[PDB]
């Protein structure tokens, strides 16, 4: 009903996803999805709210109760959202992915009457369709988009990209039974489209995130307060997260290019806080700005008003898991070249990485650290390394050397949290890297670690400079 506040934003190497899991498809390109922005804003709002409610009342609330609490600004199945998102990309016109021609029919001959895997590799500036059955053929095509030979080697070097590329790189054809050139040609044509679309990575996407507020939602009970907290959290999302895939590894990292507030009584305390980022001379300046905006909420912002409402629900520390920001962990550096940093994040967060190998030794703690802070990791009950060592280091009781002790991680009595830390595949990373920029070429690197409810009195003192040394090595 009324334009609340505009934002000019910038995202670097965004890895947005569509139905085909790529930013481009035979029908359109979408480098930024307003749905992802809405969902990530809600996620960051919940994280920020738990940070608030924990830095005062030491409590933590379930995501259900929080979402029910904020459903006046964010809407639910019982109320339409009060804020409406509109992303506008400049030069975000109607492009798509066209694959004009691919010269198959020679890769098909070495396929027929066989059961061969067909890997692809795109290095050497040409597409070479390797065959598991020990055969290699180069393919000639001419496509709509032009892979800029910087993205190629970027994907080549970034061991994280080259990994998630495994899923768009091959098929296992079976041509023993009846197998005609037409369907084989279509199989490999779609394989080639899938591979080629992975390379729509355009650094420095600029877009305008407009936000409209429905004035009909007048001060129902605490609307202005909820809304001001939502805007605080949107700013914190722009300053601590990115959009798309692998945001916890540097990609999609957002940056503020300009901010314009249109309803002063609401966004006047956020437009200034955003000007507070349109220019950043040095790193510690940025770290100071971050801690300022973070503490500004924990005590300086409105109050503990609705935290005293009977709509919330305390978590069960053994069956629920929430995250919340910890201001003590906000390492900052300065980049001077982004691609190299994005490449070295791997060495930072890999169990055999030569930037954490040299920060943690005896390796078990090393595994442990990742398994507690680096998201899900495929653990095996087959070769001893699981036996005891990680099982003893994550244990909340039973020793006092591991600077991290999971709340409900029991030796041989693993009930839930063992089956979540070691079995749940979709577990985010607490250790996250963001790449920020001012309107000059001052590129920094926020490192930070989200605080999780499943920790039993984390040693903040230890990781505070383990994380510092990690930021040191990747830069």
């Amino acid at each position: 009903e009324e334009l609340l506040m505009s934002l000019k934003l910038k995202a670097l190497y965004p890895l947005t996803g569509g139905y085909n899991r790529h930013s481009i498809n035979p029908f359109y390109e979408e480098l930024v999805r307003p749905t992802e922005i809405k969902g990530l804003w809600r996620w960051w709002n919940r994280v920020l709210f738990n940070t608030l409610a924990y830095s005062t009342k030491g409590k933590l609330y379930t995501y259900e109760s929080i979402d029910r609490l904020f459903e006046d600004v964010f809407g639910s199945e019982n109320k339409k959202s009060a804020v409406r998102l509109e992303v506008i990309t400049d030069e975000g016109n109607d492009n798509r992915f066209e694959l004009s021609y691919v010269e198959l029919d020679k890769v098909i001959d070495c396929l027929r009457n066989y059961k061969r895997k067909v890997s692809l590799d795109f290095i050497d500036n040409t597409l070479i369709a390797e065959i598991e059955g020990s055969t290699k053929i180069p393919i000639s095509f001419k496509s709509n988009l032009d892979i800029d030979k910087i993205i190629k080697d970027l994907v080549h070097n970034n061991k994280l990209l080259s990994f998630e590329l495994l899923g768009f790189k091959s098929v296992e054809i079976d041509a023993t039974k009846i197998s005609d050139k037409k369907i084989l040609k279509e199989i490999l044509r779609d394989l080639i489209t899938n591979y080629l679309e992975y390379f729509n990575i355009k650094q420095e996407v600029t877009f305008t995130l407009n936000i409209y507020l429905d004035k009909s939602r007048e001060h129902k009970q605490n609307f202005e307060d909820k809304l001001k907290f939502a805007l605080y959290s949107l700013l914190v999302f722009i300053l601590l997260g990115g959009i798309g895939r692998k945001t916890s590894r540097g990609f999609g990292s957002l940056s503020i290019i300009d901010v314009k507030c249109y309803d002063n009584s609401i966004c006047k305390k956020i437009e200034d806080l955003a000007k507070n980022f349109l220019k950043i001379s040095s790193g510690n300046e940025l770290k100071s700005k971050i801690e300022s905006i973070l503490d500004c909420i924990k005590n300086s912002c409105i109050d503990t008003l609705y935290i005293e409402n009977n709509i919330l629900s305390e978590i069960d520390p053994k069956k629920n898991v929430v995250y919340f920001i910890n201001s003590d962990l906000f390492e900052v550096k300065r980049i001077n070249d982004k691609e190299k940093v994005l490449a070295n994040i791997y060495k930072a967060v890999s169990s055999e990485g030569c930037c954490i190998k040299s920060i943690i030794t005896d390796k078990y703690v090393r595994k442990s650290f990742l398994i507690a802070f680096g998201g899900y990791r495929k653990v095996e009950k087959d070769k001893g390394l699981d036996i005891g060592f990680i099982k003893n280091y994550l244990c909340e009781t039973c020793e006092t050397v591991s600077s991290f002790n999971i709340v409900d991680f029991l030796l041989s009595e693993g009930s839930f949290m063992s089956d979540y830390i070691l079995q749940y595949e979709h577990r985010n990373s607490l250790l996250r890297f963001k790449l920020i920029s001012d309107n000059s070429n001052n590129s920094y690197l926020i490192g930070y670690i989200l605080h999780s409810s499943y920790f039993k009195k984390i040693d903040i003192k230890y990781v505070r400079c383990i994380l510092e040394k990690l930021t040191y090595c990747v830069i």
């Binding site: 510690n284 770290k287 100071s288 801690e291 400079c465 510092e468 040394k469």
Partner: protein, 173 residues
């Protein structure tokens, strides 16, 4: 010509007579107003020298000391064992920074010798022992920021955060 001086917060009694100047000009970097302490400085890589309280250097970035900035130069009986430093007000790692700065500051750190004949086993130290707490609330914080019990009758706040905002690493030798 507008200098400043850095003062630490130990668990020892080495704080009282370190500088002469309490004003110098008209402003100080560390501040106190209704909310807590501002511009609390942190110098990384340095530990304290509690016996003759000074800053002992090491090769650790994890080594750090949190302290206070006043306006002045030390006692005008120094410059043989201290570390001066002219910085453009950016390279300083403040804490709870509020106001705008001069973009030119001269800082003075109480510096010491490495005494390279023993193993530097640095130890983390918190701020406790309300004896020394209540001591430094006035012996260095009312010797400088006297305002307490005139306008800063809310001295509990200064208490609240000096118990937590400060900590360091020392040598205990």
């Amino acid at each position: 010509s507008t200098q400043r001086e850095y003062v630490f917060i130990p668990i020892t009694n080495s704080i009282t007579i370190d500088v002469k100047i309490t004003i110098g000009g008209s402003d100080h970097i560390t501040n106190i107003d209704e909310r807590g302490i501002h511009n609390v400085l942190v110098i990384t890589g340095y530990a304290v020298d509690e016996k003759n309280g000074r800053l002992v250097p090491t090769l650790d970035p994890c080594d750090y000391v949190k302290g206070i900035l006043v306006a002045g130069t030390p006692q005008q009986a120094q410059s043989n064992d201290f570390l001066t430093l002219k910085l453009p007000a950016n390279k300083l790692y403040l804490i709870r920074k509020k106001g705008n700065i001069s973009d030119d500051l001269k800082i003075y750190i109480p510096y010491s010798s490495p005494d390279a004949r023993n193993s530097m086993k640095t130890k983390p130290v918190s701020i406790s022992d309300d004896t020394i707490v209540n001591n430094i609330i006035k012996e260095v914080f009312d010797k400088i920021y006297n305002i307490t019990q005139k306008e800063k009758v809310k001295i509990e706040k200064v208490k609240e955060d000096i118990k937590e905002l400060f900590s360091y690493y020392a040598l205990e030798q």
